[PDB]
RNA sequence: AAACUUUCAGCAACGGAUCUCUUGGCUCUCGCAUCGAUGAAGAACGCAGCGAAAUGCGAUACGUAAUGUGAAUU
RNA sequence: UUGAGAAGCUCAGACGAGUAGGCAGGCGUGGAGGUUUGUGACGAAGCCUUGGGCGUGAGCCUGGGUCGAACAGCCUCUAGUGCAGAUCUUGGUGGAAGUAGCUCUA
RNA sequence: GUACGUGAAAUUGCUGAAAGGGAAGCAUUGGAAAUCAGUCUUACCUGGGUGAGAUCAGUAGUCUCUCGAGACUAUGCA
């Protein structure tokens, strides 16, 4: 079953690299951010770090109850 | 030979050639891809190999040019083992210094048919439904049966009949809930 | 390469509407007169070489494959080698008998079949 | 036939059909004349001359269970598969409904229907490839007794094999005029109350058993005060599943001056029994107590429920 | 034989037809608008009251050269007729219908007429094809529930 | 035509259908029927061997017992019974008569011989689960049994013996070994194991150490009539896939020296040998049959049609008659004529 | 195939000859095939049937039907047999035709004349 | 709104296309040579079955005799 | 690297109105020779359909309905071979109109 | 159902839905309503246990082809 059985139109070799995300310069860690969408919109969060592309976020549970969670910046 | 057979086979007419769209198909039992190509001629190709399924295993059929005037005899076989991997061996020792077009077109319809081996043994194993054939005459028949048979029925003649009868014989208790007070009375005066 | 249809609408000959003896098949215009043979503004369209479709996919169906006419459970067992292009469809006038073997060959194949329902039921 | 000519063939015919009219016309005015002279003429040619039927005259079958009662049927139906229902400890019916793999919501609007028709039947949506013998022995452990699949292809709900639980009989319907509430003129709405059932019209001995298997799947005691009645009834083969919302009110044709007004609730539609086996149904492996041949159904006289 | 018309179910209806009428088409097309719906009694006095000239047929889509009266101020248009071949096939049609029902054990205070209709016979004139249901007026069964 | 028939309440009926009768046949004669027994489901009935001009009858409940079916109307010439602790897990599943002595196989392979005069019985354990098991008509001392999952074996008690063996040491534990045992076939074309359920037992060399090579043939839930050879070898001769529905009953037809199956789907059909082909059907019969009789000329069918259906051994129908309760066997008393 | 140039393949020609035949030629246009025992007994293979021969019907609806040929109509090519009848709807018995072709003959009304076109077709009587 | 008008769909009419059929036509080829005063071709009138707006026949009137085939005609 | 229907596969660039007229390639119909070890009473052909799909198009495939005995793909041969018009031919059927006629009328 | 195989279009009636005010039908784009189409996770890989069988036997025979190539028949399941 393993002996290809059709023309095998393997993909060319795409030089395309993955970089790491440019976040901008006011999503710093610890910025209060406004949420935009979801089910927490309108909501202020504090950014607890930056993951790859989204920010961890949580409000102080005990303020807003907004968990830890992940946002899109 | 082989090109004057292309020349007529290829391009005037062969029985085993069906026309698509896109690309000719040949039903030569002997094509390994199952086109019409030059290539995958088995009659314009005089060393020719291809694997086909027999009774559950497979086979490499090989044909020579040195074979071509016996038809009884131009075709020789050899039982491709059940291991794959030695199937692929097996294939590459017998086409020994063949074109590796012609190894690579036996060993794409080898996998094809070691797949198709797998599924239908797959299938065997699952429970599937049969396929019942629908019956023109019987449809119509049966459709026009059925509506004689609903007029000849009365259904509601024969709902309201049973349900007065079973009123008159009381299957309730002593006053019904079912009726009000003047049907019960009325009821009481003829049944009694 | 998915399949990209320059245009979905037919091309309906210029007054079949207006007149029932004129059927819909296309017709090229004629008349000199005629504003659609001029090609005026706000007329149908008429079709042109720059219409047809890419030749990689033409004769595709929305799902990939092409259909391929199947008359018997020999014309199945040619698919074989080019189920991932092409998909069955059996012959109009191909009996119920026949549609079931053909239907239970070509599920060992591993073919897709464009019509495998017709002319039968089905009992589990 | 004699006239190959078209035109001169059919003048015939009209002369002939003329001719028929009038003698008939003739015999029948005559007759009338000395019918008034003589009513005990008329009593004679009425009573004598009963317009034939195909009831009157279906062909004779001596499975036809007869109205007097039979020992030997009661003790056959004294210990049988249904007698937890039909006996002192009047077993409560539970019923499974469930459909094909695969359904689509055409299935579900006829599903929902029959779960209206009948109160304690659940519904679970079939998964993956579970069979329905695997069905049936799970269902058996969860307290059901009587198992409802709905087969439906291309958006058609066409066929019904209801299996009798744990081990019992299995029969299979083939359906037709599939109809909802909305698509019956003058529907009604169907409330929680228990439907009464009316069984029709099943004289012969197979009949007895398709009778016994829908009477078992409806509560024992019915809601009178719903006046919801579920009528199943057999004609010339053809099993007609109806409801309808009854109400007793005063008729005058009727000879008693009493006869009820009905407005239906639905589902409507008609079953052909095609086969009933012994045990659970399996199509390949089952052993066929019944198995309708559509040769000998061309009899119109000739019938088997 | 079957008619334009889903009902004429044997239980609650009654049929009854007339082909190759001779009378004409467009008459009998509107004296079949206007005794559809009415019941089975009231049709037959309202057929009486047209062959007395009390009650006029009001010519309705076929109203070219039609003259107006009063009597159509029910029927709420003006123009209107009195013809008597299209009312006498129409009564006759509707005895034989009511008979009809009185075979099949309908009740017989509640029928209406639920379908009535007019065809084009072959031209022989014109003929005309009239075919007519009359149903039990179904009443709704209170819920009580 | 003189027949015994017993159903699934337990009660006997003695018909006396002749040729020519058809119930179904307003015009037709009704058949005489004498019935007796139990009218109780727990004591149905569920084989019916005839000894003779004796009928042994087994029930549900393990109450076997014997009729005498010369005189009429027939009395229990003798009764048997079975222990409880024997019947709540198992049941019967063949039983029949040789040298004197009563085969009462049950499921679990449990086996009961019982010899009629000395009234003597000895149990013999045996293989799992069973389904047929069949002595051998002509040699003492021959068991054939198989189950679901349980390959066709011989069990010989008697060695060779060289000409016969005396009735009262048979069926003794000690002396009986199997000298055959079934070898599965190969695999079938889509390497998948061919399943094994043996549901009837047959032993043809009527129709085809000594007296062996024991000539016999199988018929399986997955319905295949496999021909067994001993001398050709554990597996069998030849296979044929004879029906798509698990086939029920077995047995030859001595008339045309010839063999017949039924199986579940209502189908009972003449298999020819020789011609390794199957020669018409028993047409005219509904519903799955429970058990059928050959005795000469004369083969008797009953099934879930409620019916009693003659045939010959050249699949005519003779006679036909209905009766009402659901039948579980049927047993050819007399093949003449009743006038005869 | 045929090389006579004095017999026609004309499917034209073959129907009007069936079609428009004397009754002289209809009495052979409509034989019947002896049974076996009368096959090997009366060494002929079929004969034209006539009034009073004893036949079996092999196909149709009334396979089985044994009986006499009442009447041998010709005008239609059909036979008609004792009780192989169909109810009407006043309840009169209308006689149905078989094809002679259909039918197999059990026992033959012998005459003298018969019996010399036996042993005119190589047949011992 | 209703009516009317218009559009679409279902059913029912009307009509007789399409398809399939075909004891017919058309065309070619082959063999043959035979009307009448011993009353022809044609026309008319009858006969008896009929459906004749057809056929057969001639007061011996569906023909009679003879040679057949051999049990129907319908 | 398998991508030799060499009549195939592949790479690149430019261009695209069109009457008369010229030149290629195709679609469809009746019949014929060959072929598909072709389709068909478990339903051929035709017809209907707001079912689905393919082709720039001529057209083709298909589901459902209806229906009841034949029919098609490919290679070649053949021709009485494709319609919206001809104040076209034959047949069928409309609006005028229940009008002209023989207040309301029958 | 003899107004008789199939039963197209033009045309007509009834019913249902929708739109209505005069160039209209029509073309383009979407909405709404109605309806329809196909696309499914299921297999693959890996490990062990249990049995199985051959294209495996430190195995015995037959048949057909050209030593060995196919087909089988016994026997064992490492």
Redesign the interface.
Known sequence: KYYPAYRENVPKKARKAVRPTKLRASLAPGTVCILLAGRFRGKRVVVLSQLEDTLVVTGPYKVNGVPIRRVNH | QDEVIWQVVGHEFCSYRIKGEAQNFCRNEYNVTGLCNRQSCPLANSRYATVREDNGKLYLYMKTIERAHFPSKLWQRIKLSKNYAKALEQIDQQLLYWPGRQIHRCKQRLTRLTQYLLKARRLALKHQPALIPIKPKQAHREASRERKALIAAKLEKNIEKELVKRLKSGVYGDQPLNVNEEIWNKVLAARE | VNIIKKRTKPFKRHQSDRFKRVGESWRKPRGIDSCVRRRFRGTISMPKIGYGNNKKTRYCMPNGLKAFLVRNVSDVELLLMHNKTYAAEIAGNVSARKRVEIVEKARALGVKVTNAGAKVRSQE | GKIKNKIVRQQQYMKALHQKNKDKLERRKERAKEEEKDPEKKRLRLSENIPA???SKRV????IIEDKPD???Q??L??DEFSAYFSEERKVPKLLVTT??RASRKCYDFASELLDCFPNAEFRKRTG?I??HEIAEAAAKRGYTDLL?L?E??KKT??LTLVHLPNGPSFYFTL??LQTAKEI??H??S?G?IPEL?I?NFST?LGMTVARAFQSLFIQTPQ????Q?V?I?C????L?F?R???????????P????????ELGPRF?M?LRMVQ?GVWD?????????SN?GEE?D?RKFWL | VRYSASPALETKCAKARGAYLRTHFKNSREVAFTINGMSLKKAFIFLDNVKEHKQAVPFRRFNGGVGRTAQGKEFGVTQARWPVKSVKFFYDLLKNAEANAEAKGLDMDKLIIKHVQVNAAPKQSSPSHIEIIVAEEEEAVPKAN | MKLLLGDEIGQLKFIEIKKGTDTSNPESEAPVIQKFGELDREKGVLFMLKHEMNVFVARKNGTIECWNVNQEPPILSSLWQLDSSLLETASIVSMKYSNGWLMLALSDGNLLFRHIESSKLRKLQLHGPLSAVELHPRIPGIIAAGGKENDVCLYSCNPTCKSNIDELELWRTENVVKVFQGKNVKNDSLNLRVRVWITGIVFTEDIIDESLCFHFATITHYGQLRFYDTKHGRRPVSTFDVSTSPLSHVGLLPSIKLLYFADKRAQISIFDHSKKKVIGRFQGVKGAPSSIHCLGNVVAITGLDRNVRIFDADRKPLANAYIKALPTSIIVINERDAEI | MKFSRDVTSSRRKQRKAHFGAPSSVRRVLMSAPLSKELREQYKIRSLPVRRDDQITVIRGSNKGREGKITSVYRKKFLLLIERVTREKANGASAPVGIDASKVVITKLHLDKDRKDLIVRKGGKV
Do not use: C, P
Request: proline share 0%; net charge neutral; charged share 40%.
């Open positions: 039927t195909i009831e004779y079958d001596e499975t020992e030997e049927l003790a056959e004294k210990d094909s793999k490839d069979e329905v699949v087969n292809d291309r066409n066929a037709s005029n003129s003058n009604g709405r409330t109350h009316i029709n001995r009178i005060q719903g006046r009645v009528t009834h004609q010339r083969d053809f007609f109806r309808h919302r009854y109400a007793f009110r005063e008729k005058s044709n009727m008693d001056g009493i006869g009820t007004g009905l407005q008609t052909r012994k199509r390949k492996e089952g052993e066929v107590f019944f198995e559509a061309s119109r």
